[PDB]
């Protein structure tokens, strides 16, 4: 069984893929879930319109 | 703390007074809100910076539609009345030079 990077992908490939799948969903709903904010968070200062 | 802090302390509140915007001050002081959203600290300086000349304008139309107030007036003429006070008697005594007896009295004219 050659070992060579190249074809050795086609073996290596595959785990990777399920470990990263298994790492995005874990960042998904975790990660961005707790840190993230969306829809353009920001602070907001009002003012009143003096006489 | 007993006997100097004591009597210093209305002197150093005084400059403090002077040097400093009360109104800023008074505003920065109270901390919090009660329900209603722009009471943080960030908001307040906005607002002071606009209530400088918001309260000129006010203290201006008060001057106008409200009967006039002595200390008002005295404030508006302090420096005419309080720091060059001397002003008006070398004045007056330039204006009767003329017929008095300071010119004998190493004096100028």
New interface residues.
């Given amino acids: 069984t050659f070992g060579e990077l190249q074809t050795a992908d086609d073996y290596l490939h595959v785990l990777q893929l399920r470990s990263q799948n298994k790492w995005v969903k874990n960042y998904w709903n975790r990660s961005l879930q707790e840190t993230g904010k969306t829809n353009k968070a920001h ?6 319109q ?2 | 703390a007993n006997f100097v802090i004591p009597y210093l302390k209305p002197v150093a509140d005084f400059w403090n007074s002077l040097c400093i915007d009360q109104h800023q001050d008074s505003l920065f002081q109270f901390k919090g809100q009660t329900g209603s ?2 009471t ?1 600290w ?2 307040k300086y ?2 002071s910076e ?2 400088v000349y ?1 309260h000129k ?2 203290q201006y139309h008060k001057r106008v539609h409200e009967a006039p107030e002595l200390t008002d007036v005295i404030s508006d003429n302090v420096y005419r009345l309080t720091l060059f006070a001397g002003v008006e008697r070398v004045l007056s005594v330039r204006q009767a030079q003329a017929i008095l007896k300071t010119q004998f009295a190493g004096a100028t004219e």
């Fill in positions: 602070v907001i200062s009002p003012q009143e003096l006489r | 959203l722009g943080d960030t908001s906005l607002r606009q209530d918001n304008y006010l």
